[PDB]
Design a protein around this ligand. Sequence first.
Ligand SMILES: *[C@@H]1O[C@H](CO)[C@@H](O[C@@H]2O[C@H](CO)[C@@H](O[C@@H]3O[C@H](CO[C@H]4O[C@H](CO)[C@@H](O)[C@H](O)[C@@H]4O)[C@@H](O)[C@H](O[C@H]4O[C@H](CO)[C@@H](O)[C@H](O)[C@@H]4O)[C@@H]3O)[C@H](O)[C@H]2NC(C)=O)[C@H](O)[C@H]1NC(C)=O
Ligand SMILES: *[C@@H]1O[C@H](CO)[C@@H](O[C@@H]2O[C@H](CO)[C@@H](O[C@@H]3O[C@H](CO[C@H]4O[C@H](CO)[C@@H](O)[C@H](O)[C@@H]4O)[C@@H](O)[C@H](O[C@H]4O[C@H](CO)[C@@H](O)[C@H](O)[C@@H]4O)[C@@H]3O)[C@H](O)[C@H]2NC(C)=O)[C@H](O)[C@H]1NC(C)=O
Ligand SMILES: *[C@@H]1O[C@H](CO)[C@@H](O[C@@H]2O[C@H](CO)[C@@H](O[C@@H]3O[C@H](CO[C@H]4O[C@H](CO)[C@@H](O)[C@H](O)[C@@H]4O)[C@@H](O)[C@H](O[C@H]4O[C@H](CO)[C@@H](O)[C@H](O)[C@@H]4O)[C@@H]3O)[C@H](O)[C@H]2NC(C)=O)[C@H](O)[C@H]1NC(C)=O
Ligand SMILES: *[C@@H]1O[C@H](CO)[C@@H](O[C@@H]2O[C@H](CO)[C@@H](O[C@@H]3O[C@H](CO)[C@@H](O)[C@H](O)[C@@H]3O)[C@H](O)[C@H]2NC(C)=O)[C@H](O)[C@H]1NC(C)=O
Ligand SMILES: *[C@@H]1O[C@H](CO)[C@@H](O[C@@H]2O[C@H](CO)[C@@H](O[C@@H]3O[C@H](CO)[C@@H](O)[C@H](O)[C@@H]3O)[C@H](O)[C@H]2NC(C)=O)[C@H](O)[C@H]1NC(C)=O
Ligand SMILES: *[C@@H]1O[C@H](CO)[C@@H](O[C@@H]2O[C@H](CO)[C@@H](O[C@@H]3O[C@H](CO)[C@@H](O)[C@H](O)[C@@H]3O)[C@H](O)[C@H]2NC(C)=O)[C@H](O)[C@H]1NC(C)=O
Ligand SMILES: *[C@@H]1O[C@H](CO)[C@@H](O[C@@H]2O[C@H](CO)[C@@H](O[C@@H]3O[C@H](CO)[C@@H](O)[C@H](O)[C@@H]3O)[C@H](O)[C@H]2NC(C)=O)[C@H](O)[C@H]1NC(C)=O
Ligand SMILES: *[C@@H]1O[C@H](CO)[C@@H](O[C@@H]2O[C@H](CO)[C@@H](O)[C@H](O)[C@H]2NC(C)=O)[C@H](O)[C@H]1NC(C)=O
Ligand SMILES: *[C@@H]1O[C@H](CO)[C@@H](O[C@@H]2O[C@H](CO)[C@@H](O)[C@H](O)[C@H]2NC(C)=O)[C@H](O)[C@H]1NC(C)=O
Ligand SMILES: *[C@@H]1O[C@H](CO)[C@@H](O[C@@H]2O[C@H](CO)[C@@H](O)[C@H](O)[C@H]2NC(C)=O)[C@H](O)[C@H]1NC(C)=O
Ligand SMILES: *[C@@H]1O[C@H](CO)[C@@H](O[C@@H]2O[C@H](CO)[C@@H](O)[C@H](O)[C@H]2NC(C)=O)[C@H](O)[C@H]1NC(C)=O
Ligand SMILES: *[C@@H]1O[C@H](CO)[C@@H](O[C@@H]2O[C@H](CO)[C@@H](O)[C@H](O)[C@H]2NC(C)=O)[C@H](O)[C@H]1NC(C)=O
Ligand SMILES: *[C@@H]1O[C@H](CO)[C@@H](O[C@@H]2O[C@H](CO)[C@@H](O)[C@H](O)[C@H]2NC(C)=O)[C@H](O)[C@H]1NC(C)=O
Ligand SMILES: CCCCCC/C=C\CCCCCCCC(=O)O
Ligand SMILES: CCCCCC/C=C\CCCCCCCC(=O)O
Ligand SMILES: CCCCCC/C=C\CCCCCCCC(=O)O
Ligand SMILES: *[C@@H]1O[C@H](CO)[C@@H](O)[C@H](O)[C@H]1NC(C)=O
Ligand SMILES: *[C@@H]1O[C@H](CO)[C@@H](O)[C@H](O)[C@H]1NC(C)=O
Ligand SMILES: *[C@@H]1O[C@H](CO)[C@@H](O)[C@H](O)[C@H]1NC(C)=O
Ligand SMILES: *[C@@H]1O[C@H](CO)[C@@H](O)[C@H](O)[C@H]1NC(C)=O
Ligand SMILES: *[C@@H]1O[C@H](CO)[C@@H](O)[C@H](O)[C@H]1NC(C)=O
Lengths: 99, 49, 240, 50, 225, 49, 49, 326, 38, 49
Amino acid sequence: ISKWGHFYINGYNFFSTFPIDCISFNLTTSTSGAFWTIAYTSYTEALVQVENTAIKKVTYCNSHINNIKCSQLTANLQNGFYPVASSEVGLVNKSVVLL
Amino acid sequence: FNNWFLLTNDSTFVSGRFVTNQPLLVNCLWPVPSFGVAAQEFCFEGAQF
Amino acid sequence: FNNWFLLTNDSTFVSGRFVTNQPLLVNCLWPVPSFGVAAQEFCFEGAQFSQCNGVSLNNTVDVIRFNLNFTADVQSGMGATVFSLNTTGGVILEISCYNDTVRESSFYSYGTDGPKYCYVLYNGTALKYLGTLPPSVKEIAISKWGHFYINGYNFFSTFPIDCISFNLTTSTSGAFWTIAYTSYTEALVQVENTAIKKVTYCNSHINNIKCSQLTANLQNGFYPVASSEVGLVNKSVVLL
Amino acid sequence: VENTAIKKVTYCNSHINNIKCSQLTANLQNGFYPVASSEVGLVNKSVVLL
Amino acid sequence: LTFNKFCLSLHPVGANCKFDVAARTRTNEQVVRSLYVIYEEGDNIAGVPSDSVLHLDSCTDYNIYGKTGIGIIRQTNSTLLSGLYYTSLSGDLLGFKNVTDGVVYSVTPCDVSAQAAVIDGTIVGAMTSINSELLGLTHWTTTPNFYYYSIYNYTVDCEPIITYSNIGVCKNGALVFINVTHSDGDVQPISTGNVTIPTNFTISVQVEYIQVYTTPVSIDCSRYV
Amino acid sequence: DLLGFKNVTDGVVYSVTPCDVSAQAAVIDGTIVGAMTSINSELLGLTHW
Amino acid sequence: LTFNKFCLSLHPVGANCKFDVAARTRTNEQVVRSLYVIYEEGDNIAGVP
Amino acid sequence: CNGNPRCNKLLTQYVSACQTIEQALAMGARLENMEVDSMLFVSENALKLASVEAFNSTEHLDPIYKEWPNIGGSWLGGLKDILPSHNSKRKYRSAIEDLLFDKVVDEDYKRCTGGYDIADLVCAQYYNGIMVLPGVANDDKMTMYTASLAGGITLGALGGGAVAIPFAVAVQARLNYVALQTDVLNKNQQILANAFNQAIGNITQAFGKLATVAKALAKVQDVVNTQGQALSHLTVQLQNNFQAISSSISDIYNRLDPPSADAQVDRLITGRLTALNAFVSQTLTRQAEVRASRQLAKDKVNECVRSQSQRFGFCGNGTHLFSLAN
Amino acid sequence: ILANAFNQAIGNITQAFGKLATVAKALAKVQDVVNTQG
Amino acid sequence: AFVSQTLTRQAEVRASRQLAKDKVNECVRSQSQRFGFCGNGTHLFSLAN
Ligand SMILES: *[C@@H]1O[C@H](CO)[C@@H](O[C@@H]2O[C@H](CO)[C@@H](O[C@@H]3O[C@H](CO[C@H]4O[C@H](CO)[C@@H](O)[C@H](O)[C@@H]4O)[C@@H](O)[C@H](O[C@H]4O[C@H](CO)[C@@H](O)[C@H](O)[C@@H]4O)[C@@H]3O)[C@H](O)[C@H]2NC(C)=O)[C@H](O)[C@H]1NC(C)=O
Ligand SMILES: *[C@@H]1O[C@H](CO)[C@@H](O[C@@H]2O[C@H](CO)[C@@H](O[C@@H]3O[C@H](CO[C@H]4O[C@H](CO)[C@@H](O)[C@H](O)[C@@H]4O)[C@@H](O)[C@H](O[C@H]4O[C@H](CO)[C@@H](O)[C@H](O)[C@@H]4O)[C@@H]3O)[C@H](O)[C@H]2NC(C)=O)[C@H](O)[C@H]1NC(C)=O
Ligand SMILES: *[C@@H]1O[C@H](CO)[C@@H](O[C@@H]2O[C@H](CO)[C@@H](O[C@@H]3O[C@H](CO[C@H]4O[C@H](CO)[C@@H](O)[C@H](O)[C@@H]4O)[C@@H](O)[C@H](O[C@H]4O[C@H](CO)[C@@H](O)[C@H](O)[C@@H]4O)[C@@H]3O)[C@H](O)[C@H]2NC(C)=O)[C@H](O)[C@H]1NC(C)=O
Ligand SMILES: *[C@@H]1O[C@H](CO)[C@@H](O[C@@H]2O[C@H](CO)[C@@H](O[C@@H]3O[C@H](CO)[C@@H](O)[C@H](O)[C@@H]3O)[C@H](O)[C@H]2NC(C)=O)[C@H](O)[C@H]1NC(C)=O
Ligand SMILES: *[C@@H]1O[C@H](CO)[C@@H](O[C@@H]2O[C@H](CO)[C@@H](O[C@@H]3O[C@H](CO)[C@@H](O)[C@H](O)[C@@H]3O)[C@H](O)[C@H]2NC(C)=O)[C@H](O)[C@H]1NC(C)=O
Ligand SMILES: *[C@@H]1O[C@H](CO)[C@@H](O[C@@H]2O[C@H](CO)[C@@H](O[C@@H]3O[C@H](CO)[C@@H](O)[C@H](O)[C@@H]3O)[C@H](O)[C@H]2NC(C)=O)[C@H](O)[C@H]1NC(C)=O
Ligand SMILES: *[C@@H]1O[C@H](CO)[C@@H](O[C@@H]2O[C@H](CO)[C@@H](O[C@@H]3O[C@H](CO)[C@@H](O)[C@H](O)[C@@H]3O)[C@H](O)[C@H]2NC(C)=O)[C@H](O)[C@H]1NC(C)=O
Ligand SMILES: *[C@@H]1O[C@H](CO)[C@@H](O[C@@H]2O[C@H](CO)[C@@H](O)[C@H](O)[C@H]2NC(C)=O)[C@H](O)[C@H]1NC(C)=O
Ligand SMILES: *[C@@H]1O[C@H](CO)[C@@H](O[C@@H]2O[C@H](CO)[C@@H](O)[C@H](O)[C@H]2NC(C)=O)[C@H](O)[C@H]1NC(C)=O
Ligand SMILES: *[C@@H]1O[C@H](CO)[C@@H](O[C@@H]2O[C@H](CO)[C@@H](O)[C@H](O)[C@H]2NC(C)=O)[C@H](O)[C@H]1NC(C)=O
Ligand SMILES: *[C@@H]1O[C@H](CO)[C@@H](O[C@@H]2O[C@H](CO)[C@@H](O)[C@H](O)[C@H]2NC(C)=O)[C@H](O)[C@H]1NC(C)=O
Ligand SMILES: *[C@@H]1O[C@H](CO)[C@@H](O[C@@H]2O[C@H](CO)[C@@H](O)[C@H](O)[C@H]2NC(C)=O)[C@H](O)[C@H]1NC(C)=O
Ligand SMILES: *[C@@H]1O[C@H](CO)[C@@H](O[C@@H]2O[C@H](CO)[C@@H](O)[C@H](O)[C@H]2NC(C)=O)[C@H](O)[C@H]1NC(C)=O
Ligand SMILES: CCCCCC/C=C\CCCCCCCC(=O)O
Ligand SMILES: CCCCCC/C=C\CCCCCCCC(=O)O
Ligand SMILES: CCCCCC/C=C\CCCCCCCC(=O)O
Ligand SMILES: *[C@@H]1O[C@H](CO)[C@@H](O)[C@H](O)[C@H]1NC(C)=O
Ligand SMILES: *[C@@H]1O[C@H](CO)[C@@H](O)[C@H](O)[C@H]1NC(C)=O
Ligand SMILES: *[C@@H]1O[C@H](CO)[C@@H](O)[C@H](O)[C@H]1NC(C)=O
Ligand SMILES: *[C@@H]1O[C@H](CO)[C@@H](O)[C@H](O)[C@H]1NC(C)=O
Ligand SMILES: *[C@@H]1O[C@H](CO)[C@@H](O)[C@H](O)[C@H]1NC(C)=O
């Protein structure tokens, strides 16, 4: 469930509602005695390998080597030279010149 | 990734490698044990539980 | 294909082979013999007549083609009118040629040897001027949608024609000519000097391959084809 | 132009100068070049209609 | 057709597009008015011919989850735990899932490409992936990669007129397998023991074509443009 | 491009040709010494032919 | 942004382009009016924050 | 056109381009097939001698070679990785060939129309009108060709059965061709055989997991990748809208009246024809390059494997002795 | 014998050219070259 | 595009011309010692048309 109102069941968005400020639940497994999980997650960029509509491997582009891996679409980089950027530009001053 | 899927608004990929923006930065993980009850009014303002 | 031409709305090909949809499915062929008169009020509803040479189809007729030399020996038994047209809404149009020029929205004053000026008449008055009769007319094709082709070129069009009347003869020339009731079909046509030389109908699998390859003499080899055609099929709808 | 300064100007005022301007060089190498046989100026007008 | 929002109006304000209202006479059609449309993409609202049918094992016109086409739909034993429908690299629908029970269905084209063999201006055989009659051919045989239909009486030793790789087709329509060329072998530079030396020679002539030059073209760029 | 047409009155055929055509000029030592052309007319300041 | 001429109008006559005036609610945005712009390229007039 | 009859009727005015595209592809394939067919050949006796088991036995040796235990002899340790063996998945396959075809790398189209599962990439391409002609027969012919070339070296005679000679005798003949040997008593082929065995073992180790080996691996991987990418691009070109509402002809015909639908479909037709023309041009260029490479390979086979060339530095860097092919 | 074989081979080649895998390959190659040029 | 295609063809024909020159020099004007170069078999002489 996304805070923008979208519901995904097994990965597919079947229905959407108005944006949700806050949501309530109260679930249990009764007497089955089964443990399960709840995940509070955020969006991030990653390389995902899928086999038969199932996730097999996830590589996060969180480091320079991981950035190269994501750029090359492979988790096993062969030895060699790869083009990269020397740095990123962030907060910068503004200069205006007019006649 | 047994109960984890790639979210999509359209047809789903069967096989291959893709660079995508997915909800995968796990802010928190709550394991509900056997014979346990998970009840919460969670508002989207943080998950430091 | 001596008095047969490829119909066109534009410039005409001089030489080469082209796959085109042309009025070439001959529903009926009427040979007018020497010293004979061909008179008919043909309405476009079939051409199963007793004078058809061979076997006549039951399909509807698309185009009617007159194959004859339109020389000075050609005479009409309806006077100056060569073709009487009945269009939608009961509007009568006549194609009439005279020996003298007729003013617009006027009628012939004197009512054989010389230039002939042809006009379209609606209520006995000249509506459109078509021009003089050229000395080399070999075929006149008329479609039920109102288009007229002279030697393959569409010179004028009228309202859609429900049914058309004529009454022609070759006088004392003693020349036989032809009338063809034909329908549109796809075929490969070879043209040399704006003249039809060979026609291949795509009516069989081998003919389909020939039309696809733009040649009537296929070399031995393998060619890609479709395994079948899809016709009438059920419809399936799935929704959430 | 060299360093935003004019160094050489060649006017396309002759046939050889026209070829030089077409080839973007003032020193043509020996060879064959495509050209036009003439220019069309004031001409009559002809209209043909049905 | 499916939409999330659909509205008709007589005013142009906020309209994504407009229709053309026209009057048709016996010989002419004249536009008189305009009808404006405000629409949003989605699937909440669907237009129907009048106020869920699935045909299986037969060619049909399908409209499944907004994807339309012609094909044959078959139930499968496959299990795919993620998604609703699946598409190919070119965007064609390959399969979908029934939401009620999770059963997977596959979609295949009704007609496929085939290879027709033409010898002496007639069709003698056809290679196809579907075991069905085509091109007026009735008899057929099975090969490890395809079905082969032929005018040859199938329930052969002949010269292949048309060959590709190991496959050859005879004028009677029969299918033959072509093997690699055989030769006696090469004479070895051995001078020990029993050896063979070629003695009786005839003459063979072999033809080889080689291209030497092209046909150059000069282009007047100004005259072409 | 239009190549020819016919006069409807008498059936006479007329042909249309371009007024100017492409030519090949020979340049030796920065001057024009000759020209190859399909029209027998003077061009590029050349008289003898 | 620099222009040689910039005019806003409520009439479509002579306008190069138009803006879309809309009302934004808590869940929807609806276009109500149009504001037409007549502009010319240049640098005589410049918009500033 | 994805099987749409109206799209086919529209394309009937463009049949010439499809005719040009199809003829260019069928003639290129035919020419390549006729030069490959002319290139390859086998010999029956050489194939009967070309195996590890035959080289490890003495059933084919002439009675005069009683001293030698088998055909391979001291060289067999290097020849077991090159000669075909019975412990292979396919016939006439060697260890190096299997290693190459596994490290670097179905043709049945009857399974695509079965509908027993979701179609894979090859079947999906076939649904789009793209067929890959069979190539397994070419690989089998090539492996038989190389096996026959290897086995012909030890064939003592051509007019009868499979009579064999020891490999050391052939090596000695090659040495005499290089230079007339004058020390018959002090033959030292053991050093050469040991060096050959060690080199072959190191090459096999490199292929399983030496600049020439790396260059060859890079070249074959590049060839495979280039072959795949062109078809991938051609398939992916079918998703382009070409300034139309949709890339699906069926959707266009289901959403629009025929007069507007035809105008929408014409743009897709033109774009797809342009893509096919580009693919054909690239294919023809590749085919010409591979024709030149095939001429080079034929020269190498004729002058380094079937004979001992007198050209300096043609069969490798050094004084050439013999060459084998896989 | 060599002269007779040469004469027969040349005659067969001429017959093939007027209306033998090498001859077919050469004809296909030259036709392909002409068509590609056009 | 036409120029690019023409240049590629010209390079291919240059390679073919080199092959033809080698064939003329080694099979027609002399008797080559290269095995299997002037056809399949023991070469005797070659003619050209
Ligand atoms: C299926 O389709 C639906 C519908 O299109 C998609 O839903 C969209 O989901 C995305 C996130 O994946 C939503 O994007 C977010 O929009 C929020 C609203 O943005 C407004 O406000 C910001 C400033 O606050 C403006 O810049 C912007 O123009 C809008 O006016 C934003 O608040 C979010 O931004 C913040 O969060 C992201 C992280 O999520 C940060 O990167 C940003 O910097 C910022 O902090 C965010 O961008 C989008 O609104 C949804 N659309 C709708 C219509 O609801 C589904 O994603 C799609 N599903 C799949 C699987 O593809
Ligand atoms: C020179 O230019 C003129 C003017 O454009 C062309 O004249 C057209 O000729 C074609 C035939 O060649 C005419 O096409 C026909 O239209 C008829 C009217 O169609 C309407 O009704 C049908 C349903 O009944 C609707 O589907 C359609 O949208 C229209 O509303 C149709 O009745 C005809 O269809 C039937 O006949 C054909 C065989 O002819 C069958 O294939 C069909 O299945 C069907 O049974 C037919 O399609 C067209 O109307 C003419 N246009 C005009 C404006 O009059 C000339 O053809 C052209 N000349 C040359 C040489 O190119
Ligand atoms: C390069 O050029 C060489 C020659 O310089 C070619 O090699 C020749 O290839 C041919 C074709 O394969 C060989 O001829 C074949 O011999 C087989 C065995 O021959 C028997 O009969 C003769 C009778 O005189 C005996 O001398 C001989 O010992 C054998 O007992 C035949 O079986 C072959 O017959 C074919 O035709 C009949 C008729 O239909 C069929 O039934 C057979 O199955 C078969 O198809 C054929 O006669 C010839 O021996 C080879 N000569 C040499 C010197 O090696 C190469 O092929 C060529 N290379 C390339 C790549 O083209
Ligand atoms: C939720 O459903 C999933 C299936 O989607 C259940 O997972 C399955 O659990 C069974 C029983 O433990 C597993 O069976 C085992 O199979 C292996 C073969 O790989 C075998 O070696 C074991 O001995 C055993 O038979 C099954 O594999 C497993 N499937 C997957 C994909 O993990 C899961 O148990 C269900 N959870 C609950 C709480 O019911
Ligand atoms: C209608 O006009 C056509 C011409 O467009 C007439 O056809 C022509 O008829 C003449 C006289 O029969 C033919 O002349 C013959 O020419 C051949 C040479 O090929 C010669 O061998 C014969 O001895 C004779 O001189 C002429 O070829 C022929 N032209 C064509 C194209 O067929 C036709 O006769 C006219 N019909 C009527 C009824 O007037
Ligand atoms: C790759 O090549 C290297 C040499 O470049 C091979 O290593 C060499 O192996 C031989 C034996 O095969 C060693 O020679 C000696 O052999 C006798 C055999 O009786 C033994 O008694 C001696 O103790 C000694 O091992 C030689 O020293 C050795 N050379 C080096 C530099 O290590 C290697 O085996 C080859 N690899 C493969 C996988 O074939
Ligand atoms: C194509 O080649 C074939 C052979 O592969 C040629 O047929 C052969 O023709 C010769 C004569 O040229 C026949 O030999 C004999 O010639 C003497 C001449 O005096 C004659 O008295 C004998 O009765 C006999 O004809 C030979 O048998 C024959 N071979 C075959 C298999 O038919 C053929 O002529 C060549 N074609 C051309 C157009 O050159
Ligand atoms: C075609 O025209 C001829 C010639 O005008 C018509 O023949 C006339 O027929 C009427 C009776 O209908 C007779 O009184 C006339 O004497 C005939 N004239 C001649 C010259 O013979 C003929 O009837 C017309 N055909 C049709 C079907 O109307
Ligand atoms: C032109 O065709 C129209 C077609 O309608 C003819 O009008 C019909 O004439 C018949 C004669 O039996 C009447 O029964 C119908 O009621 C008429 N229909 C209409 C709609 O008026 C008309 O007569 C034809 N014109 C000529 C001169 O023959
Ligand atoms: C999906 O599967 C369900 C069953 O799991 C199908 O529902 C059946 O539909 C038929 C035809 O209307 C009914 O006779 C049955 O009673 C239904 N079975 C149920 C509800 O359990 C449904 O048709 C399938 N959907 C498809 C094929 O699109
Ligand atoms: C080479 O072949 C010859 C025959 O051409 C062989 O000589 C024959 O050998 C057999 C088997 O021992 C004897 O029965 C014959 O009497 C021999 N014939 C003659 C004329 O001597 C010879 O043995 C073969 N040589 C080799 C090395 O195999
Ligand atoms: C087509 O040819 C006719 C003659 O067949 C030309 O008509 C002539 O025009 C000139 C100039 O006006 C008159 O002096 C003649 O008397 C006309 N001759 C006739 C009517 O027989 C006509 O000009 C030609 N059309 C062109 C050249 O476009
Ligand atoms: C093509 O020729 C090869 C080589 O002669 C044939 O291979 C033979 O196959 C049979 C059957 O398995 C074996 O018993 C022989 O030993 C093989 N011969 C050799 C020399 O290895 C092959 O069968 C032929 N293929 C066809 C389809 O006829
Ligand atoms: C700022 C760049 C200066 C020049 C850097 C030169 C060296 C590094 C890049 C080498 C590229 C090698 C290309 C071949 C592929 C490979 O072997 O990796
Ligand atoms: C469903 C198809 C299965 C595979 C069919 C293979 C055989 C038939 C086609 C051969 C193509 C030959 C291409 C070269 C040109 C030619 O010689 O005709
Ligand atoms: C009207 C043109 C008739 C033909 C003219 C032929 C001769 C002149 C042009 C020669 C072109 C040479 C091209 C190669 C480049 C060069 O050497 O200049
Ligand atoms: C902008 O400039 C100021 C000084 O004018 C400097 O202190 C500051 O770091 C600059 N900000 C940047 C470069 O982001
Ligand atoms: C449609 O399905 C029915 C049964 O529901 C069948 O009888 C009919 O033949 C089908 N029509 C086709 C396949 O055109
Ligand atoms: C136009 O034609 C007239 C004669 O009608 C002629 O004198 C004049 O030179 C022509 N003008 C041109 C060719 O520019
Ligand atoms: C699919 O299921 C059927 C029984 O419904 C069975 O006969 C068939 O073999 C199965 N196929 C596979 C591949 O499991
Ligand atoms: C084909 O062969 C079978 C063999 O049983 C025979 O019965 C049949 O008549 C043959 N058919 C033809 C058309 O010859």
